[PDB]
Amino acid sequence: MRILVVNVNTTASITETIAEQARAVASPGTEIVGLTPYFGAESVEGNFESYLAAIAVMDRVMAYDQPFDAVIQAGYGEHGREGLQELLNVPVVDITEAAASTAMFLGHAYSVVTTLDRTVPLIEDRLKLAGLYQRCASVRASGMAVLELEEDPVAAMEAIVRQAELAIREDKAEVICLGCGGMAGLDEQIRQRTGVPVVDGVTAAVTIAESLVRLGLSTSKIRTYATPRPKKVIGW
Amino acid sequence: MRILVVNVNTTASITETIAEQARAVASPGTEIVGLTPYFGAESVEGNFESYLAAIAVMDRVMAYDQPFDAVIQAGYGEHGREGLQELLNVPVVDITEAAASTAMFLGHAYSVVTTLDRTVPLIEDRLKLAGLYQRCASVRASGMAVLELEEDPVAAMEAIVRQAELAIREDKAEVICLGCGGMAGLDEQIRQRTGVPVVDGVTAAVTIAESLVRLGLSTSKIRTYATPRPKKVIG
Amino acid sequence: MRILVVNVNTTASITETIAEQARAVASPGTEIVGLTPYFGAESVEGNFESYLAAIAVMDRVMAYDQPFDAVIQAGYGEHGREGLQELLNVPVVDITEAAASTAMFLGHAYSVVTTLDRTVPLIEDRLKLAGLYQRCASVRASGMAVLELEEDPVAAMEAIVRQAELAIREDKAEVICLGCGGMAGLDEQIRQRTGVPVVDGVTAAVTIAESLVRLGLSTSKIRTYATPRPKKVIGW
Amino acid sequence: MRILVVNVNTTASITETIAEQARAVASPGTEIVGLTPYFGAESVEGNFESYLAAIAVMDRVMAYDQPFDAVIQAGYGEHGREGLQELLNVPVVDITEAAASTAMFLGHAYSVVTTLDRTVPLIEDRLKLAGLYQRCASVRASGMAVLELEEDPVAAMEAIVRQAELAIREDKAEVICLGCGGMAGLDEQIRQRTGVPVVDGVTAAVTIAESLVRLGLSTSKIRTYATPRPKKVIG
Amino acid sequence: MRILVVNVNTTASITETIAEQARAVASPGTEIVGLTPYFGAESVEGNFESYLAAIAVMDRVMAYDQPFDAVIQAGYGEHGREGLQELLNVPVVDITEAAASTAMFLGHAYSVVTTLDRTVPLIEDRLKLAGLYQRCASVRASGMAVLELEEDPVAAMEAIVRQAELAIREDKAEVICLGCGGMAGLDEQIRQRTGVPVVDGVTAAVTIAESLVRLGLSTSKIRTYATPRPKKVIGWP
Amino acid sequence: MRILVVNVNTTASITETIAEQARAVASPGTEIVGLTPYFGAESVEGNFESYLAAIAVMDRVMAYDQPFDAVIQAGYGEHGREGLQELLNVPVVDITEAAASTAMFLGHAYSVVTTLDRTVPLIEDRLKLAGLYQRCASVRASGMAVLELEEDPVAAMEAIVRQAELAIREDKAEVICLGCGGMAGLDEQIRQRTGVPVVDGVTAAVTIAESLVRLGLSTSKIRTYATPRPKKVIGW
C-alpha cells in the first residue's frame, strides 16, 4: 500500500523528519511518500496560516499522480482534513486525532504538548470537533516555535518535558500526545523523562491509516464527505 | 464607517443581492461595500469548497486597498472568520453567528433553515465552535441548492417555509434563521407564513458590525487572534 | 424609537448613571427612558433580591404609561427577562446577555468580572440559561460591593483590574465583560492594562435593542414567551 | 417537626389537596401546614406567573409566624427555591427537584409529564439549573392546563398516561414524574398501564424534607445561599 | 422494614461501623442488617477491586435468605449498583449517589472528599454516569488509604479536613460529601471544623431507602434494569 | 507478537468465530489466541451479566500463563476494560471502543447497531465513559438476542440492516459499527445494502492492539490504572 504523508508547512526538512518516523513504523509493504505543499507558511501557527495550509495540503495531494491508499495530514490542530475527506476516496488521518485516539486506549486522560500558546485553542477546537476532547486533561504549550526545535534539541526537550510534568501533576494527564508534526520521534525521550506513555501522532497515524486500508475501510461518502457537487469553481 | 460585505462564493449576482439587503439596514453614514472573491466555487456547498472560500475571502479582503471599519463574511457555515480576525484589526462578523446570536434574544430556541443537507453538519459544527448551538432547536435543509433559489424561487420558497414549519412544530423552534447568504431578504415572507420572527444573518450582521464600531470594539489581539507571527509564507 | 432601560435596584442615582451611559451610545432619535422599580432592594446581591427585582422590574415596566419599542433590563445576573418577554410584544434585552453575546464576536473566550462572590453563581446560571456560557472562560468577583463602587472605588478599581488580569492570564479570557450595573463606563483602565476589549452590557444592550427594532424583530410569541393566559391573578 | 407545604398558586383548594397528599406519607411526629400565597395567579403557567409565584411564596413563608423545620415549595418548574434558601435557615425542597432526584434512584432515565406545552421549557430549565436534567429522557406536555385537570379528570388523565406511554416508548423513560403540583395522587393508573414507577414530587418532597431534618442537615450559608446582606429594601 | 447495608469490602469492622451509623438514623420500625461480602479486597482502591466488589456484593445479597425491603451499597465510587437493580425487585441505593443527591438540596455546589487519589476518577465517573456530577465542584483525595482512617484517625481526620477546606475555598464547594464508606459518622466533626453541611452517604442512603419503601417505589423493571434473561450461566451463584 | 482475544461470554463457539475473524486480519507474525472465560453467562445481555463477565474475563486472562503482548476484550458494551488495564502491563483494547474509535476516522457521525434494546444503555454508557460518544449518532437495537444471531442469520441480517438504514436516514449516521461480538463478519452485507462503511470491532481491535504493540505503547500505570495496591484480597 502507499500512504501520502503530507506536511502542513512548506519546510521540506520537517517533511523529511516526519517521513522518516513514518517509515520507521510502517509495516512491510507500506510505502511512505512524504509530500511538502507547494505554498503556505514555513510553519503553521495560527488561524490564517492554518487555513492556508488546508488548501496547500489539498492542492498538494491532488497534484499527486501515482495511485495511493490513504493520506496522512501531518499537522497538529490544523484545518483541512474534512476537505481531503470530500476530495478523496481513500482514508484521511490527521495526526492530531490519531494521537488523541490512540492515547485514549492507554490512560484515563491525555494531555497534548504543543509549540506556541496561540495554537492551543486551535488544537482544543479540533479535538472538540473530532469528539476526542472529553478525555483531554489539557493542551499545553512548550513556548517554543516549531522551527526552533532542531537548533537546540536539549532546550526544546526541556521545554516540552516541563509542560508534560505539569500536565501530569496538575492536569492529571496519564498520557502525553506530541502536539506538533515537527516533534515527530521525540516521544521515546519524553517518555523516558516523564514516566508516562507518549504518543507521536505521526507514527500513530501511520498505524491507523494502515489499519483502515487493511480493514477495507474508507471515508463514508454518504453525506458530509460526499464528493463535491460538480459546479463552476474558479482556480483549482 | 465602511463595512466590507464579502460573498463567500464567486457568483456576483449573489453579492449584489447581499449588499443591497445590507445597504437597506445600514445606518446613515455607513457605507456598504460588497466584495466577490477572485476565486472559488460559484456556490459553497461542503468542506472543500468552504476551505477554498476561506482563503478566497481572506485574499479578497487583503487585496482591498481602501480603509474600512468592519468586515462581514456573508456565508453560512463557512470557515474563515478566524483567519480574517487574525489578519485584521477591525471587527469581523459572520452571518451565521450574527443570525443565531440575535435570534437568541427573541425566543427560547431557534432553528436554521439551510439549502443542502450536506451543509447541515457544517453549520452545526460552526454554531458549536461559536458556542451558539445550545439554544439551537435544529438545523434543517430545505433540500434546494443555493443557485436554485433564483432559478425556481416559488418552489424554493415553499421548500424553505416547509422546513420552518417542521422546525416550529417538531423541533420547538420559536425563531427561524436563514441559513444561506443567497436567502438574504427572504425573511419577511417566511415570517408571514410561520408566525415567528425570522432572522436574516446578512442584515443581522450589519447591525452587529456597526454596533461593534460604534462601541469602539474590535477583535481581541491578545491570543488566538493575535497578528500572525512574521515568517516565510510562500505563494 | 424609545427604549426603557430599567434599573434592577431601587437606587435612583444608579438608574440615572445607567441611562446616561445608555444615552451616550444611542443612535440619533433613540430616546432612552431610565426607570427605577417602585419596590425592591437598593442593590441586588443574591437570589431573594434578584427574584424580588424580577417582579419589581415587570411591575415597573407594566406601570409605564408611554409607548416604547424595546426594553433593556439593566442588572448583571438578575432574574426576570423571561417575564418581560411574555408580558411585552417588543424585544427585551438583558445587559448580561448583551454583554456576553457581543463579547463572543470579539475573541475566542470571554470572562465576566463582577463585585460580590455570591453573585457569581447567579451570573453563571443566567449565562447557562441563555446558552451563552460555552465561551465563557470564567465569572470572577473582586469581592467589593455594588454600593461600594461609588463609595470606595480606587481599591475596588484595582481589585477589578486584577480579576480581569487573572481571567486573561489564568482563565484564558480574551475579552472582559463588566459585571455590575453600576460598572457602566469603567472599561478604560482594564482595556489599557489588559490589552483586551472590554464590554459594557449597558451600551451593548442599547445597540442590540436598537438593532432588533431596526430589523423589525420582536419576541417570538409562539410558545415559551406567548402572552400569559388570561386568568385570575391576585394583587396585579 | 413542622413542614410548610406552600402552594405556588392562589387556588386554596389545590393547597388542601397538596397538603392532604403530604399528610398521607408524613411520618409520625411530622406536622404538615399547607399555605396559600396572599397574591399571584390562580394557576402558574409561564415565566411571568412563575416569577410572581416566587415572591408570593417567599412572602407567604415570611408572613408565617409559627416555628417550622423545613419548607416544601409545591409547584412544578416555577422559580423561587433559591430565594427561600437565602431567607431560611431550614432545608427547602421543591417538588420538581424532589421528583426528579428520587426518580433517578429508580431507573436509567426519567420523564416528567406536565400540563401545558409552554411550561415544558420552564421545567427543563429548572432541572438543568438543579443539575438533574442529565438523566431526564424528556419533559412532555399532556396539553391540558392546571385547572382543566379538575374540570375533566378523565380526558386529562388519558392525555397524561398517553404522554407517559410515549415518554417510555419513544424517549426511553423508565420512570415517570408528575409535572404539576395539582397532579398529586394520580400515579396509580399510569403505573398499571405502563408498568413503571411513578413519582409524585409532593410525597417525594415530604420524605426528603423529613430526611434532611432527621439528618440534621440544612441549607449551606457559606456562599450562594448566605443570608441576604441587610440593606434598604422596599415592599 | 428491613434494609441491607452492604460493605463493598471484606473488612467486617468497617461493616460494623457503617451499620452503627445506619442504625443511628434509621426510623422506628426500620431494621438495619449489615452485610460483608464473602470475597473481595479488604479495601476497594481501584478498578480491579471495584469490579471485584461489584460481583462480591451482588453475590452476598443474593445469598441473603431472609426478607428485605431495600438494599444500600455502602461503598463510594464502586461499580455494581446496576447489577443489583436488575437482580432485585426492591430499591437499591448507593451511598455515592445518596450523598451527592442529598447534598444538592443543601447548596449550589458540593465536593467529595475521598481517600486515595487513584479513586478520584472512579468517583468522577460514577457521578457522571448517575447524572449527579453537574453540581460537583470537585472530588478530592485526602491521601490516606481506607484502612488508615481507623488506625491513624487523628491524621486521617486532619487530611480530610484540609481537603474539605480547599474544596470550599478553591473549588467553591458549599457542601462536603464523605467519599468513603469507612468515613461514616465523621461528618459532624468535619462540619464543625469547616462550617458547611457535611453529608454522610451512609446515613443519607438510609433515609433515601426508607423513603422509597414508604412511597411504595422500587426499581423500574421496564428496560435497563429488567430481570436478567434466563440462560445458561456457569459458576453462579 | 501474541494477542489474547477474549470472549466476554462462555459460548466457546462464539470464541472460535471471533478468533477466526481476528486471524483473518492479523498481520504476519501476529498470533491470535481466542479465550473463553471459565464462568459467566452464555451471552451477556445486561448489567448483571456484564459485571459477571468483567471478572470472568480478568480471571481468564489471569491463569493464561503463556506470554502475551496485548489483550482484546470481545464484547460490546460490557464492563471490565479498566480492571484489565490495572492488572496488566500490556495494551488492552475493547472492541466497543475499537469500533467507535475507528469509525470516527471515517465519517461525521457513527451509529452502533446492537442486539437487544436492554443493552443499548450499557453501550451508550461505555461509549460515554470512553469519551467516544460525542460523534455517536445513535445506538440501536436490531431486536435479536445474541444467540438468535446464529439460529437465524437471514432475519438477523434483515433486522440489522433495517436499524442501520434508520440510523443513516433518521439519526444521520455515516458509518455503522457492529454492536455484538457475535456479529463479527457481517459488515460486508450491511455495507452492500447501505453504501456506508461498516466497522467490525473485532477486526478493528486487532489492528489497534497490534498497532499499540508496534508503537511500543502500553497502558499508563501512573494513576488510574496503576498496579493494584498490595493488600488482603479473597479470590472469588
CA distance B235 to chain C (A): 29
* Phi, psi dihedral angles at B98 (to 5 degrees): -60, -50
CB A33 within 8 A of CB A3: yes
With an 8 Å Cβ cutoff, is C228 touching chain E?
A: no
Q: Which three cell numbers stand for residue D182?
A: 395539582
Rg (CA), chain F: 17
Task: Tell me which amino acid residue D1 is.
Answer: M
Q: Which three cell numbers stand for residue B141?
A: 435543509
| Secondary structure of D63-131 as H, E, C letters | HCCCCCCEEEEECCCCCCHHHHHHHCCCCEEEHHHHHHHHHCCCCCCEEEEECCHHHHHHHHHHHHHCC
Planar angle of CA D218, D224, D230, nearest 5 degrees:
95
Closest CA to B196 of B217, B169, B216, B223: B169
Q: Which three cell numbers stand for residue D7?
A: 402552594
A211 closest CB neighbour out of F131, F134, F207: F207
Burial of C29 (0-12, 13-18, 19+ CB in 10 A): exposed
Closest CA to E32 of E54, E8, E5, E56: E5
Quick one: closest CA in C to E107, which residue? C121
Q: Any bridge partners for residue B140, and if so which?
A: B113
The 3-state DSSP class for residue E236 equals coil
Residue A34 to residues A10, A56, A58, A114, Cα–Cα distance (Å):
12, 14, 14, 22
The 3-state DSSP class for residue A140 equals strand
The 3-state DSSP class for residue B198 equals strand
Q: Which of A104, A108, A168 to mutate to test the interface with E (most CBs of E within 10 A)?
A: A108
Q: Write the Ramachandran bin of B158: left for phi over 0, alpha for psi from -120 to 50, otherwise beta.
A: alpha
CB B132 within 8 A of CB B113: no
CB B193 within 8 A of CB B115: no
Q: Which three cell numbers stand for residue E21?
A: 451509623
C-alpha span between E61 and F68 (Å, rounded): 37
The 3-state DSSP class for residue D33 equals strand
Chain-centre distance of CA F31, in angstroms? Answer: 18
Planar angle of CA D155, D161, D166, nearest 5 degrees:
125
C-alpha span between D140 and A189 (Å, rounded): 57
With an 8 Å Cβ cutoff, is E189 touching chain D?
A: no
- Chain D hits for E195, Cβ within 8 Å: 222
Burial of C235 (0-12, 13-18, 19+ CB in 10 A): exposed
First to last CA, chain A: 28
CA distance D217 to chain E (A): 6
* Phi, psi dihedral angles at A107 (to 5 degrees): -165, 170
CB B74 within 8 A of CB B205: yes
Q: Which of D104, D108, D110 to mutate to test the interface with F (most CBs of F within 10 A)?
A: D108
The half-sphere exposure of B35 on its side-chain side, counting CA atoms within 13 A, is: 27
The half-sphere exposure of E132 on its side-chain side, counting CA atoms within 13 A, is: 32
Residue E10 to residues A119, E35, E37, E142, E182, Cα–Cα distance (Å):
50, 9, 6, 22, 12
Torsion of CA B142, B147, B148, B154, to 10 degrees: 90
With an 8 Å Cβ cutoff, is C131 touching chain E?
A: no
- Which residues have CB under 8 Å from D93's CB, separation 6+? D70, D71, D72, D73, D205, D208, D209, D212, E105
With an 8 Å Cβ cutoff, is C83 touching chain D?
A: yes
Residue C235 to residues C8, D39, D221, F130, Cα–Cα distance (Å):
21, 6, 32, 55
C-alpha span between E27 and A36 (Å, rounded): 75
- Chain C hits for A121, Cβ within 8 Å: 108-109, 172
Q: Any bridge partners for residue F110, and if so which?
A: F136, F175
Does B58 sit within 8 Å of A51, measured CB to CB?
yes
CB C95 within 8 A of CB C181: yes
* Phi, psi dihedral angles at B40 (to 5 degrees): 115, 180
Q: Which three cell numbers stand for residue B108?
A: 427560547
- Could you give the domains of chain B? 1-235 (3.40.50.12500)
CB D53 within 8 A of CB D77: no
- Chain B hits for C207, Cβ within 8 Å: 207, 210-211, 214-215
CB D204 within 8 A of CB E231: no
CB F38 within 8 A of CB F59: yes
- Chain F hits for E224, Cβ within 8 Å: 46-47, 118, 121-122
With an 8 Å Cβ cutoff, is C121 touching chain E?
A: yes
With an 8 Å Cβ cutoff, is C172 touching chain A?
A: yes
CA-CA-CA-CA torsion sign (C71, C130, B141, A79): positive
Q: Which three cell numbers stand for residue B191?
A: 415570517
CA distance F4 to chain A (A): 16
- Chain E hits for D102, Cβ within 8 Å: 208, 211-212, 215, 217
The 3-state DSSP class for residue C149 equals helix
* Phi, psi dihedral angles at E139 (to 5 degrees): -115, 120
According to DSSP, residue E34 is labeled E
Cis, peptide link before residue D228, omega less than 30° from 0? no
Neighbours of chain A (3+ CB pairs under 8 A): B, C, E, F
Method: X-ray
With an 8 Å Cβ cutoff, is B29 touching chain C?
A: no
Chain-centre distance of CA F198, in angstroms? Answer: 14
Q: E strands of E75-131, at which residues?
A: 92-94, 110-114
C-alpha span between F180 and F116 (Å, rounded): 10
C-alpha span between A4 and A18 (Å, rounded): 11
- Which residues have CB under 8 Å from E11's CB, separation 6+? E36, E42, E43, E147
- Chain B hits for F172, Cβ within 8 Å: 120-121
Q: Which three cell numbers stand for residue B88?
A: 485584521
C-alpha span between C183 and D184 (Å, rounded): 47
Closest CA to D103 of D211, D215, D203, D214: D203
Burial of C173 (0-12, 13-18, 19+ CB in 10 A): buried
CB C115 within 8 A of CB C179: yes
Does D51 sit within 8 Å of C58, measured CB to CB?
yes
- Which residues have CB under 8 Å from C41's CB, separation 6+? C9, C10, C49, C52, C53, D231, D232, D233, D234
Chain-centre distance of CA E177, in angstroms? Answer: 11
Quick one: closest CA in D to B173, which residue? D121
With an 8 Å Cβ cutoff, is A42 touching chain B?
A: yes
Resolution in A: 2.1
With an 8 Å Cβ cutoff, is E229 touching chain F?
A: yes
* Phi, psi dihedral angles at C158 (to 5 degrees): -65, -40
Task: Show contacts of B144-149: CB within 8 Å, 24+ apart.
Answer: B144/B115, B144/B116, B145/A229, B145/B43, B145/B45, B145/B115, B145/B116, B146/B9, B146/B14, B146/B43, B146/B44, B146/B45, B146/B115, B146/B180, B146/B182, B147/B11, B147/B42, B147/B43, B147/B182, B148/B115, B149/B115, B149/B180, B149/B182, B149/B183
- Chain B hits for C97, Cβ within 8 Å: 104-105
Q: What is the DSSP string of F207-226?
A: HHHHHHHHTT-----SSTTS
Q: Which of C42, C48, C232 to mutate to test the interface with D (most CBs of D within 10 A)?
A: C48
With an 8 Å Cβ cutoff, is E170 touching chain C?
A: no
C-alpha span between E97 and E99 (Å, rounded): 5
With an 8 Å Cβ cutoff, is D129 touching chain B?
A: no
No. of helices (H) and no. of strands (E), chain C: 9, 10
With an 8 Å Cβ cutoff, is B121 touching chain F?
A: yes
Closest CA to A172 of D33, F165, E118: E118
| Secondary structure of B183-197 as H, E, C letters | HCCCHHHHHHHHCCC
- Chain A hits for F212, Cβ within 8 Å: 102, 105-106
Planar angle of CA F92, F93, F96, nearest 5 degrees:
145
CB F95 within 8 A of CB F68: no
C-alpha span between C76 and C114 (Å, rounded): 8
Largest CA distance in chain D: 55
Closest CA to E135 of D97, B224, F70: D97
CB F121 within 8 A of CB D108: yes
C-alpha span between E132 and E150 (Å, rounded): 29
Question: Cell 521515546, residue?
Answer: A188
C-alpha span between F98 and F71 (Å, rounded): 12
